RNA sequence: GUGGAAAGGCGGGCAGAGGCGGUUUGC
RNA sequence: GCAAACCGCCUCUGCCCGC
């Protein structure tokens, strides 16, 4: 009932907002089929939007605080105000953002491990296709998916 | 025929699209401004024993536009014969209603052809509001004036008919002086401006005894169909009384009309365009 | 007189079927019809009662037989008594009989009045008094003999009451006989009255064109063109009333409305006291656009273009060429009344003159002869409220401001536009009279005010079919307008600036403009004359008489419920401007004009069976703009809910992207279940949010500028998350919970998203609170 | 008569947000282009702008400018507004609906005043056309790319209202330009008299410093002005080159100039061909 | 009636951020709650015009409302005025100070063109009316962050901080936690006033009058919770100038300049004011 | 020999008031 | 041997006035 509920593009949006162990593999497996999009760059369509809303189902169930990634939301925020007209090179800052995303996973601990688990899991390779990577096309790509894990993380009552 | 196509391309909002007989007045205001009284003259005498121009009409990135001619209103049933009766009341609906043709419609619709209408034209009646304030206490009183704003490539042109040497002399060098200062409306508010460009047109026309106008005629004899035009504007502040033109897509037959002269209380005396643009048509029985 | 007793001949033989339904006598109503006038002319009533029961003795053809047992009965009853002949009376009994065929080109049962508009559903009967009573054709149900044994009852108080005259029995038989059928079967959807005032249309257009008893006896009078269709159609109407300036605050604009339709009952009524007929002849007057059966002689070929001389050359001396009347006349005969074979005649001798009306407006001016020929006039200036070219010494001061020089044509609309709630219609007389406001082509109109003597040998008499304190030497002429105004703390018409500052939220004007759709292929399925004169008046009396009574606040159960801001007040602040023809233009407060945009078109969903929609255009603008813009946006915000699937109504105007897919007009059935979703979670009742969002319209105002990204580019999905981090934080994921989402079936179905046609329940709701 | 066109180019940079309103989802919407959305800065909201800030000018020296002048003469400092009548004694002599506005009457009083004669007047039975044409500023191809890359254009400030005592807040928004917008301005002076054309240039140019120090449009006092001209390029267009076409008119060039670098500091050193060839 | 020019006196400096500074506005995705305003295109946080200008009229609205029997010998039009607000009756002008409904507020608006003419307060800040509308004499640009500070933000360096605060509830002892952007202490921008010189009879008091309200704003707050720490503004002054009306027309240097680049807002209206005002009253 | 000539969508308005990064006990 | 339970926004306002 939970992989049905999870179609291709949207099946519901407000059907898996009243929506534990049902999604605890569908999501997951999934969340492994986000794991397996290793091409960050390969789906300019809904599928962003459509892997997001899985993404984002299977850790508001968990924790996952907002304060503890706005070191990270602010982290691609101030260097999206570098990608316009201010830098070229993001090469010295997304190490810096996967030095702080090694120091997100390692100052949480206690039960937001399984949360920061996945949080782990899903961006660190498409930022491994990123480090040698420019920074105008691939990286709107990645924060435009980066602003749906958040957005639809309010919309499933997460905070 | 092979006429001129000179395109305006505007550099801002137009008040109205223009006609036959106030680009007559922008031009002899240019040459009186640049060559003198003395080429006024010759250039009024030079559309009475030549040729002549047309109203100007809009287009959208080389898609030119003409207006509809008045032949195909009594025609219209035989027009779409091939129309099933569930759409064919609406067809001739919105094509008896239509004002602008394309150039290949255009060419149909003198032959009495099925043709369609376009989807888009280039330009809306918007209404940009103003204020008036006072100096000392900014009182606002607002007023209301509309304006004529284009597309990105669209504009509007006229054609010429005629020889080159009345055009490379008089028609060419009006059209500079006439895109840095305006062709009507508040060109003190960069208005009527535009850029200007001179092109080919080809016009496939039938030979028939019967013609179009494609200008502001005021016919002498009676003409065939028409659509009346009842207007006068003003010139250097007098006022010119209200003349009962005919619009372009009028049929007329063997009519050349005629410029009439006016008095005005002026120095000069004041010319109003009354020369038709004839192409070629077929009509139904009447 | 044969010329008045032809009239009232045919018009008053098809009387005694209302007897015949309610059973007074033995039946054959050939029979009851003879002895119904015959016993109004023993107890009050003259003695050419006693003559008129011939006609409705004498039809059907079961009593006129071996042309001997009628010149028995006519012979004790005396024409010698009025100054009729022998052969003279029974001339006209042979001219009414062909006339009831021509206008039918066709039992014993009890069957009501089924509709024009659907066959299978009938309305019941009821009375032509424009109150209390939409009829709606609903389930057939057989009336009733107590039904119409009290439709005679009111009938005979009325028919002694009146003077036996053509002009007087019109508007009793239209009160009374309008939804009773004319002949009892199976799906007859002509009127009775419709049928008696179609009758005595062709009898009198049978005498006029000189055919006697020979002529009809050898079927001479058809196959032979011997009558004369005149159809006539005012061209400009738009162009004539709504291009004025900044000037005549709806005083003025409702009085040009009012002094055209003047215009059109001058020409109208001109014909009819000129070439000898009766108003019957009228087949409809309907909103500049009128047709009239006339005969075909010499003499009135040789006057009708006399009359249409006299009208354009005025037109053109007063308008300069703002308005244009194109009158055309076709010859037609007997056979072209009906329906031959299977080929309908009648719908072709109408496309026929249609045809030489599209001609001639194509030929605007031409019988002028100084229409293209200048002509040297000095001194000349412009009104400043309309815009005409007059010579100055003839502009005056107004009686607004002294200063402005208008022309003395809009110094009379003016005063007129003042007296228009103190007007119960005018008076028709010469142009050289005193008390005339304003000037016909023909003839000088007076005003009849509410307390006075009228003077005028034609009378018209606005909203009412009863001739009140009119002279028993005057013609009565009732005709109706949609005359709802809004009316300030004094008497007198509401303004531009009063009324949009009672509107529920922001100061707009609400201007709405809407006609009935592809009604000129549903005259098409007319195959009679007497057909097409009652589908004529039903869509003219929607207009006319069925919109007031809308604005009043009936119709609660057939009307239901609406997209309404507020409640539906007892006082609405609107103003007809015109309505009438198929079409209506009414401004008013904005937030009442949008309710009344779902509230008459419903009205007109149930007034015809379903099988004619509206289509309606929607503007709102500000008070300072001139009417001659705000029409010129509306009309063609109307055109463009009209080139469409066609049942749309325009409500707003909102941005789209440039693909072609997206539409600007909502459709009808579409908005209208798109408010009972979303208008009862943002909105409460008169002007109020709901709870949990009071204060909170920084949600909703920003949730515009998240379908703006859509408005550039539907490619992006940009407003999909955008969406559901807004409605996220402020705890509202209940509220508005399909505009989260994409929709995956709707590119498969090629249309557009959910967050397309959201735009117009919310920025009607944004603006209807303070804003 | 007619001698040449002085054209006049550059650049309108928007050092501060920018509103030019049209009240018509925020609640004060600035005007944009009605098929693309693009705002722009008007004709008639510039050369009014121009010309509101040089009647002040005057009116604080018609008794100083009364022998270059004529005209000035006739005219009090003031306004018309308590003796309620039109061209009477004072200075802002003509009502038009409600506030009054220095317009002078007359053809040859127009021709000696310093402001009718550039911007043009009414008059009954005169009508003097102006010689400046302020045509409409859009946004520059610099910032129609960055239009078309994602980014917006207006922003929406929301301001309020406080009570003084009990401190309620009452907030509105405005919309206005991001400020920094690069807009593409022109005028284009038309020389009738080859007299007084030097005076007409440097009114016109005392007119954009005064518009530096004011605002352009909108609240303006609460920062929604801020307008500085960075210009291009001068031309002159002369008779000869309408006539004929050949490309031969004389060219000034200031491609980073001030309004002030420009009226004194290159006045001379800048048109001396142009009053070279009068 | 007679509104005429003489200059623009353009008072320029530098706003100091003693403490941290927050001017807030609504709501991007991922961010701090309660943000503090950005200019959208370099983005970076700024002081406007009207948080600047309204603040100063705030300040001195109820300085002239206390002192309604020393400035009304002085200024005409504080006769029509007694102490107070018209938050008790709900009519717009009767006898008190503040006399408008804005939408809910009372604020000081004089409602004529010559009753504003002469109130101290709206003959610098200006006003509206029916029929009659006294524009303002004081323009204040919005202030952008210095150009030392730019580089700054180009190093690396928090332009911003994030402070949270607990609203603890008094019984339970309960925490109740959010966060608050506010620009860094030390942190430098940069203002712009330009009082207009419509008259040269009254425009000694008006300079004061500016000054006065600006000496209140460094001993108040500008912006944000000043009563919690977020306030403490310091005015820097850099240039006082006057722009003759010489200078418009010619393009020269004409314009005075009175140089006070390390004084204090006080030491400004100080006895002195005599003294570094005197070329500018040798122009008028 | 231009339905033209002249006309600032403008004046006044603080995103502000209130609020200790805290307490509870053990796993 | 050392930390985890909970708390992450609450409630007021939201265009006036003039042409
Ligand atoms: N007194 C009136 N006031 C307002 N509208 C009216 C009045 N009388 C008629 N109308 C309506 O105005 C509409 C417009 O008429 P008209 O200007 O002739 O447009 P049109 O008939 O479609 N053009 P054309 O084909 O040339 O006649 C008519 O169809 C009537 O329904
Ligand atoms: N009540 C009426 N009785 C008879 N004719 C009418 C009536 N109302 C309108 N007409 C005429 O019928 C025609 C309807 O024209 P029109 O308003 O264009 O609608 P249409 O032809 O059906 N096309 P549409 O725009 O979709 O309504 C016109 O010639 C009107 O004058
Ligand atoms: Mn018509
Ligand atoms: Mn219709
Ligand atoms: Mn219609
Ligand atoms: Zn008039
Ligand atoms: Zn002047
Ligand atoms: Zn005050």
Redesign the pocket.
């Given at each position: 009932v939970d992989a049905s509920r999870l179609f291709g593009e949207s099946p519901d949006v407000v059907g898996i907002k009243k929506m534990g162990k049902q999604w605890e593999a569908i999501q997951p497996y999934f969340d492994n089929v986000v794991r397996e999009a290793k091409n960050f760059l390969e789906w300019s369509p809904n599928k962003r939007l459509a892997n997001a809303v899985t993404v984002a189902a299977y850790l508001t169930s968990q924790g996952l605080?907002?304060?503890?990634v706005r070191k990270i939301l602010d982290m691609a925020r101030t260097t999206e105000l570098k990608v316009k007209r201010g830098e070229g090179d993001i090469k010295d800052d997304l190490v810096k953002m996967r030095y702080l995303l090694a120091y997100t996973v390692g100052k949480?601990?206690?039960?937001?491990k399984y949360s920061l688990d996945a949080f782990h899991r899903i961006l660190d390779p498409m930022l491994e296709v990123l480090m040698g990577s420019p920074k105008k096309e691939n990286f709107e790509k990645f924060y435009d998916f980066l602003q749906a894990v958040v957005a639809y993380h309010?919309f499933f009552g997460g905070? | 025929p092979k006429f001129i196509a000179v395109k305006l391309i505007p550099k801002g909002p137009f008040?109205?699209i223009?006609?036959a007989?106030?680009?007559?007045?922008?031009?002899?205001?240019?040459?009186?401004?640049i060559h003198?009284?003395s080429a006024?003259?010759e250039?009024?005498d030079a559309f009475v024993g030549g040729a002549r121009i047309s109203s100007a009409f809009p287009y959208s990135g080389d898609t030119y536009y003409l207006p509809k001619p008045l032949s195909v209103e009594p025609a219209l049933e035989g027009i779409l014969t091939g129309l099933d009766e569930e759409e064919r009341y609406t067809t001739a609906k919105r094509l008896r209603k239509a004002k602008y043709l394309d150039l290949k419609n255009f060419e149909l619709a003198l032959r009495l052809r099925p043709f369609t209408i376009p989807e888009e034209i280039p330009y809306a009646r918007v209404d940009?509001?103003?204020?008036?304030?006072?100096?000392v206490?900014?009182?606002?009183?607002?007023?209301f004036?509309e304006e004529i704003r284009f597309r990105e490539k669209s504009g509007v042109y006229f054609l010429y008919s005629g020889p080159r040497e009345v055009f490379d002399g008089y028609i060419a060098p009006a059209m500079r002086?006439?895109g840095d200062?305006?062709?009507?409306?508040?060109?003190?508010?960069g208005?009527?401006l535009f850029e200007v460009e001179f092109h080919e047109m080809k016009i496939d026309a039938p030979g028939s005894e019967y013609s179009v106008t494609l200008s502001n005629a005021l016919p002498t004899k009676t003409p065939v169909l028409w659509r009346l035009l009842?207007?006068?504007?003003?010139?250097?502040?007098?006022?010119?009384p209200?003349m009962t033109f005919i619009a372009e897509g009028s049929i007329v037959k063997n009519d050349p009309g005629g410029?009439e002269?006016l008095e005005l209380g002026?120095?000069?005396?004041?010319?109003?365009?009354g020369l038709t643009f004839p192409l070629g048509v077929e009509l139904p029985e009447g | 007189e044969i010329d008045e007793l032809t009239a009232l001949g045919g018009l008053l033989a098809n009387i005694g079927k209302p007897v015949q339904r309610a059973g007074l006598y033995s039946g054959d109503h050939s029979t009851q019809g003879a002895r119904f006038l015959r016993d109004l002319a023993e107890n009050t009533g003259r003695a050419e009662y006693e003559l008129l029961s011939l006609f409705s003795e004498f039809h059907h053809k079961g009593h006129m037989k071996n042309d001997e047992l009628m010149i028995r009965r006519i012979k004790e009853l005396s024409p010698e008594r009025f100054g009729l002949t022998m052969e003279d009376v029974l001339n006209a009994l042979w001219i009414v009989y062909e006339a009831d065929n021509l206008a039918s080109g066709e039992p014993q049962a009890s069957r009501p009045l089924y509709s024009v508009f659907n066959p299978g559903k009938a309305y019941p009967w009821a009375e032509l008094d424009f109150e209390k009573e939409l009829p709606v054709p609903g389930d057939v149900f057989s009336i009733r003999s107590q039904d119409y044994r009290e439709l005679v009852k009111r009938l005979w108080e009325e028919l002694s009451k009146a003077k036996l005259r053509s002009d007087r029995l019109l508007p009793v038989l239209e009160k009374y006989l309008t939804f009773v059928s004319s002949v009892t079967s199976e799906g007859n959807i002509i009127s009775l009255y419709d049928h008696m005032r179609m009758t005595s249309a062709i009898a009198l257009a049978m005498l006029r064109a000189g055919c006697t008893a020979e002529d009809v006896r050898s079927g001479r009078c058809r196959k032979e063109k011997r009558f004369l269709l005149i159809e006539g159609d005012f061209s400009g109407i738009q162009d004539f009333i709504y291009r004025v300036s900044g000037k005549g605050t709806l005083k003025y604009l409702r009085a040009r409305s009012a002094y055209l339709e003047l215009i059109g009952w001058d020409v109208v009524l001109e014909i009819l006291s000129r070439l000898g007929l009766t108003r019957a002849n009228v087949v409809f007057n309907a909103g500049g656009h009128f047709m009239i059966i006339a005969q075909n002689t010499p003499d009135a070929v040789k006057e009708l273009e006399e009359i249409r001389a006299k009208a354009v050359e005025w037109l053109y001396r007063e308008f300069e060429s703002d308005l244009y009347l194109a009158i055309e006349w076709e010859p037609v005969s007997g056979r072209e009344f009906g329906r031959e074979g299977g080929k309908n005649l009648f719908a072709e001798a109408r496309k026929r003159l249609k045809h030489k009306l599209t001609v001639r407006k194509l030929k605007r001016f031409g019988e002028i002869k100084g229409l293209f020929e200048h002509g040297h006039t000095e001194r000349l200036a412009?009104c400043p409220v309309c815009?005409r070219?007059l010579p100055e010494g003839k502009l005056e001061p107004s009686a607004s401001d002294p200063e402005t020089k208008v022309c003395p044509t809009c110094n009379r609309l003016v005063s007129l536009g003042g007296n228009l709630p103190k007007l119960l219609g005018f008076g028709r007389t010469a142009k050289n009279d005193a008390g005339v406001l304003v000037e016909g082509p023909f003839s000088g109109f007076v005003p009849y005010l509410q307390g006075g003597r009228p003077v005028g040998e034609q009378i018209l008499v606005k909203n009412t079919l009863n001739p009140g304190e009119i002279p028993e030497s005057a013609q009565f002429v009732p005709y109706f307008v949609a005359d709802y105004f809004k009316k300030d703390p004094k008497g007198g018409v509401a303004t531009f600036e009063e009324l949009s500052m009672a509107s529920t939220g922001?100061?707009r004007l609400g201007v709405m403009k809407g006609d009935v759709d592809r009604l000129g292929e549903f005259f098409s399925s007319m195959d009679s004359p007497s057909k097409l004169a009652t589908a004529s008046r039903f869509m003219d009396y929607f207009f006319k008489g069925y919109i007031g009574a809308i604005i009043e606040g009936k119709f609660g159960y057939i009307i239901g419920d609406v997209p309404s801001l507020r409640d539906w007040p007892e006082e609405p602040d609107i103003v007809v401007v015109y309505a009438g023809g198929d079409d209506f233009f009414i401004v008013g407060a904005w937030d009442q004009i949008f309710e009344l945009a779902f509230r008459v078109r419903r009205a007109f969903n149930a007034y015809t069976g379903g099988k004619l929609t509206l289509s309606v255009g929607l503007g709102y603008f500000?008070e300072?703009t001139p009417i001659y813009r705000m029409a010129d946006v509306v009309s063609e915000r109307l055109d463009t809910a009209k080139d469409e699937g066609r049942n749309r109504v325009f409500v707003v105007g909102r941005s789209r992207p440039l693909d072609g897919k997206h539409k600007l007009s909502y459709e009808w059935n579409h908005y209208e279940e798109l408010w009972r979703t979303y208008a009862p979670r943002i909105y409460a009742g008169n002007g109020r949010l709901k709870g949990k969002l009071?204060?909170?319209?920084?949600?909703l105002?920003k949730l515009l500028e998240i379908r703006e990204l859509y408005v550039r580019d539907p490619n992006d999905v940009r407003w999909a998350y955008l969406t559901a981090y807004l409605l996220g934080?402020?705890?509202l994921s209940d509220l508005f919970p399909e505009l989260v989402g994409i929709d995956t079936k709707a590119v498969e179905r090629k249309e557009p998203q959910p967050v397309y046609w959201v735009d117009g329940v919310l920025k009607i709701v944004l603006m209807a609170?303070?804003? | 008569r007619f001698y040449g066109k002085i054209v006049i180019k550059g650049k309108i940079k928007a050092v501060t947000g920018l509103?030019?309103?049209?009240?018509?989802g925020i609640?004060?919407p600035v005007?944009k282009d009605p098929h693309t959305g693009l705002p722009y800065i008007?004709?008639?909201?510039?050369?009014?702008?121009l010309?509101?800030?040089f009647?002040i000018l005057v009116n604080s020296r018609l008794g100083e400018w009364r022998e270059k002048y004529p005209s000035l003469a006739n005219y009090s400092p003031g306004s018309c507004r308590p003796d309620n009548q039109e061209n009477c004694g004072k200075f802002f002599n003509?009502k038009?609906?409600?506030?009054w506005?220095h317009?002078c009457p007359d053809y040859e009083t127009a021709l000696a005043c310093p402001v009718?004669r550039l911007?043009?007047?009414?008059?009954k039975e005169?009508?003097?056309?102006?010689?400046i044409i302020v045509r409409d500023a859009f946004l520059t191809k610099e910032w129609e790319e960055k239009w078309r890359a994602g980014e917006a254009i207006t922003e929406a400030?929301?301001?309020?209202?406080?009570?003084?005592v009990t401190?309620?807040?009452?907030?509105?928004?405005?919309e206005r330009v991001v400020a920094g917008a690069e807009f593409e301005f022109e005028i284009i002076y038309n020389v009738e008299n080859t007299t007084h054309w030097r005076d007409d240039i440097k009114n016109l140019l005392t007119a954009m410093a005064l518009l530096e120090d004011?605002?352009?449009?909108?609240?303006?006092?609460?920062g929604?002005?801020k307008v500085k001209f960075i210009f291009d390029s001068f031309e002159f267009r002369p008779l000869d080159y309408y006539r004929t076409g050949k490309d031969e008119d004389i060219v000034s060039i200031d491609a980073r100039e001030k309004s002030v670098s420009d009226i004194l500091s290159g006045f001379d050193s800048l048109f001396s061909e142009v009053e070279g060839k009068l």
């Amino acid at each position: 009932v939970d992989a049905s509920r999870l179609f291709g593009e949207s099946p519901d949006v407000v059907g898996i907002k009243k929506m534990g162990k049902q999604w605890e593999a569908i999501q997951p497996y999934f969340d492994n089929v986000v794991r397996e999009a290793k091409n960050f760059l390969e789906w300019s369509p809904n599928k962003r939007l459509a892997n997001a809303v899985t993404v984002a189902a299977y850790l508001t169930s968990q924790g996952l605080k907002t304060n503890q990634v706005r070191k990270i939301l602010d982290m691609a925020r101030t260097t999206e105000l570098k990608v316009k007209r201010g830098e070229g090179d993001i090469k010295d800052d997304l190490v810096k953002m996967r030095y702080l995303l090694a120091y997100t996973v390692g100052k949480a601990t206690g039960q937001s491990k399984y949360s920061l688990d996945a949080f782990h899991r899903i961006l660190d390779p498409m930022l491994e296709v990123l480090m040698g990577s420019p920074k105008k096309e691939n990286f709107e790509k990645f924060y435009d998916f980066l602003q749906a894990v958040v957005a639809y993380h309010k919309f499933f009552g997460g905070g | 025929p092979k006429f001129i196509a000179v395109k305006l391309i505007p550099k801002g909002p137009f008040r109205d699209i223009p006609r036959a007989d106030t680009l007559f007045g922008a031009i002899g205001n240019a040459i009186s401004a640049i060559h003198g009284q003395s080429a006024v003259e010759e250039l009024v005498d030079a559309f009475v024993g030549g040729a002549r121009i047309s109203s100007a009409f809009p287009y959208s990135g080389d898609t030119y536009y003409l207006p509809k001619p008045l032949s195909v209103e009594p025609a219209l049933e035989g027009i779409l014969t091939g129309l099933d009766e569930e759409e064919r009341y609406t067809t001739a609906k919105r094509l008896r209603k239509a004002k602008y043709l394309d150039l290949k419609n255009f060419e149909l619709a003198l032959r009495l052809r099925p043709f369609t209408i376009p989807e888009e034209i280039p330009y809306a009646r918007v209404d940009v509001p103003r204020v008036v304030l006072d100096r000392v206490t900014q009182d606002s009183s607002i007023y209301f004036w509309e304006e004529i704003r284009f597309r990105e490539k669209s504009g509007v042109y006229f054609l010429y008919s005629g020889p080159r040497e009345v055009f490379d002399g008089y028609i060419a060098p009006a059209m500079r002086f006439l895109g840095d200062t305006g062709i009507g409306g508040k060109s003190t508010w960069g208005a009527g401006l535009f850029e200007v460009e001179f092109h080919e047109m080809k016009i496939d026309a039938p030979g028939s005894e019967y013609s179009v106008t494609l200008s502001n005629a005021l016919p002498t004899k009676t003409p065939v169909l028409w659509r009346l035009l009842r207007k006068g504007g003003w010139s250097f502040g007098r006022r010119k009384p209200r003349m009962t033109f005919i619009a372009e897509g009028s049929i007329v037959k063997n009519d050349p009309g005629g410029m009439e002269r006016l008095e005005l209380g002026l120095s000069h005396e004041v010319y109003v365009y009354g020369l038709t643009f004839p192409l070629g048509v077929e009509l139904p029985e009447g | 007189e044969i010329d008045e007793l032809t009239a009232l001949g045919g018009l008053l033989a098809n009387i005694g079927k209302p007897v015949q339904r309610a059973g007074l006598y033995s039946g054959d109503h050939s029979t009851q019809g003879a002895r119904f006038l015959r016993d109004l002319a023993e107890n009050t009533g003259r003695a050419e009662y006693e003559l008129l029961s011939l006609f409705s003795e004498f039809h059907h053809k079961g009593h006129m037989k071996n042309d001997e047992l009628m010149i028995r009965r006519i012979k004790e009853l005396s024409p010698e008594r009025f100054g009729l002949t022998m052969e003279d009376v029974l001339n006209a009994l042979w001219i009414v009989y062909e006339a009831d065929n021509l206008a039918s080109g066709e039992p014993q049962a009890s069957r009501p009045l089924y509709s024009v508009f659907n066959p299978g559903k009938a309305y019941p009967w009821a009375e032509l008094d424009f109150e209390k009573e939409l009829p709606v054709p609903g389930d057939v149900f057989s009336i009733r003999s107590q039904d119409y044994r009290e439709l005679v009852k009111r009938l005979w108080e009325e028919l002694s009451k009146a003077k036996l005259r053509s002009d007087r029995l019109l508007p009793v038989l239209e009160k009374y006989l309008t939804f009773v059928s004319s002949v009892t079967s199976e799906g007859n959807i002509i009127s009775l009255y419709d049928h008696m005032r179609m009758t005595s249309a062709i009898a009198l257009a049978m005498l006029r064109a000189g055919c006697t008893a020979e002529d009809v006896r050898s079927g001479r009078c058809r196959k032979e063109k011997r009558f004369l269709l005149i159809e006539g159609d005012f061209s400009g109407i738009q162009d004539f009333i709504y291009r004025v300036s900044g000037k005549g605050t709806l005083k003025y604009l409702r009085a040009r409305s009012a002094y055209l339709e003047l215009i059109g009952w001058d020409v109208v009524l001109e014909i009819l006291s000129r070439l000898g007929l009766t108003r019957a002849n009228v087949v409809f007057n309907a909103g500049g656009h009128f047709m009239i059966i006339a005969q075909n002689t010499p003499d009135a070929v040789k006057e009708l273009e006399e009359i249409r001389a006299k009208a354009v050359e005025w037109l053109y001396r007063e308008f300069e060429s703002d308005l244009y009347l194109a009158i055309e006349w076709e010859p037609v005969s007997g056979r072209e009344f009906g329906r031959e074979g299977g080929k309908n005649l009648f719908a072709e001798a109408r496309k026929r003159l249609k045809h030489k009306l599209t001609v001639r407006k194509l030929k605007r001016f031409g019988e002028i002869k100084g229409l293209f020929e200048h002509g040297h006039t000095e001194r000349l200036a412009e009104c400043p409220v309309c815009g005409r070219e007059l010579p100055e010494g003839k502009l005056e001061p107004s009686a607004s401001d002294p200063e402005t020089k208008v022309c003395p044509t809009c110094n009379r609309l003016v005063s007129l536009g003042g007296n228009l709630p103190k007007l119960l219609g005018f008076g028709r007389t010469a142009k050289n009279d005193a008390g005339v406001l304003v000037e016909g082509p023909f003839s000088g109109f007076v005003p009849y005010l509410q307390g006075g003597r009228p003077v005028g040998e034609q009378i018209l008499v606005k909203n009412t079919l009863n001739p009140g304190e009119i002279p028993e030497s005057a013609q009565f002429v009732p005709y109706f307008v949609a005359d709802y105004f809004k009316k300030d703390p004094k008497g007198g018409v509401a303004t531009f600036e009063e009324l949009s500052m009672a509107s529920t939220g922001t100061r707009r004007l609400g201007v709405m403009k809407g006609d009935v759709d592809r009604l000129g292929e549903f005259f098409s399925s007319m195959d009679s004359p007497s057909k097409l004169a009652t589908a004529s008046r039903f869509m003219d009396y929607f207009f006319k008489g069925y919109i007031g009574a809308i604005i009043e606040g009936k119709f609660g159960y057939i009307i239901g419920d609406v997209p309404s801001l507020r409640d539906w007040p007892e006082e609405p602040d609107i103003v007809v401007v015109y309505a009438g023809g198929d079409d209506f233009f009414i401004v008013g407060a904005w937030d009442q004009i949008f309710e009344l945009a779902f509230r008459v078109r419903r009205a007109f969903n149930a007034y015809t069976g379903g099988k004619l929609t509206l289509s309606v255009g929607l503007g709102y603008f500000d008070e300072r703009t001139p009417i001659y813009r705000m029409a010129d946006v509306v009309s063609e915000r109307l055109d463009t809910a009209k080139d469409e699937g066609r049942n749309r109504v325009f409500v707003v105007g909102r941005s789209r992207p440039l693909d072609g897919k997206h539409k600007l007009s909502y459709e009808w059935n579409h908005y209208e279940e798109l408010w009972r979703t979303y208008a009862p979670r943002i909105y409460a009742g008169n002007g109020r949010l709901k709870g949990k969002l009071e204060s909170k319209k920084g949600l909703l105002w920003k949730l515009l500028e998240i379908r703006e990204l859509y408005v550039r580019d539907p490619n992006d999905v940009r407003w999909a998350y955008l969406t559901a981090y807004l409605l996220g934080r402020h705890g509202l994921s209940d509220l508005f919970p399909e505009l989260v989402g994409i929709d995956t079936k709707a590119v498969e179905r090629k249309e557009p998203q959910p967050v397309y046609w959201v735009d117009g329940v919310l920025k009607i709701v944004l603006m209807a609170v303070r804003r | 008569r007619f001698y040449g066109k002085i054209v006049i180019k550059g650049k309108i940079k928007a050092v501060t947000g920018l509103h030019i309103g049209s009240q018509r989802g925020i609640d004060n919407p600035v005007i944009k282009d009605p098929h693309t959305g693009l705002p722009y800065i008007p004709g008639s909201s510039l050369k009014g702008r121009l010309r509101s800030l040089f009647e002040i000018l005057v009116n604080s020296r018609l008794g100083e400018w009364r022998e270059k002048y004529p005209s000035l003469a006739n005219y009090s400092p003031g306004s018309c507004r308590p003796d309620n009548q039109e061209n009477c004694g004072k200075f802002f002599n003509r009502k038009i609906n409600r506030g009054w506005i220095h317009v002078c009457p007359d053809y040859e009083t127009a021709l000696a005043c310093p402001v009718c004669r550039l911007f043009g007047a009414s008059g009954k039975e005169s009508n003097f056309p102006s010689r400046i044409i302020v045509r409409d500023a859009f946004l520059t191809k610099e910032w129609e790319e960055k239009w078309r890359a994602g980014e917006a254009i207006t922003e929406a400030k929301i301001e309020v209202g406080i009570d003084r005592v009990t401190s309620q807040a009452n907030p509105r928004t405005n919309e206005r330009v991001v400020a920094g917008a690069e807009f593409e301005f022109e005028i284009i002076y038309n020389v009738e008299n080859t007299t007084h054309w030097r005076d007409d240039i440097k009114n016109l140019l005392t007119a954009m410093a005064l518009l530096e120090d004011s605002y352009l449009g909108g609240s303006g006092s609460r920062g929604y002005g801020k307008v500085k001209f960075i210009f291009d390029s001068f031309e002159f267009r002369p008779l000869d080159y309408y006539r004929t076409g050949k490309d031969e008119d004389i060219v000034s060039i200031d491609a980073r100039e001030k309004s002030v670098s420009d009226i004194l500091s290159g006045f001379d050193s800048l048109f001396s061909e142009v009053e070279g060839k009068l």
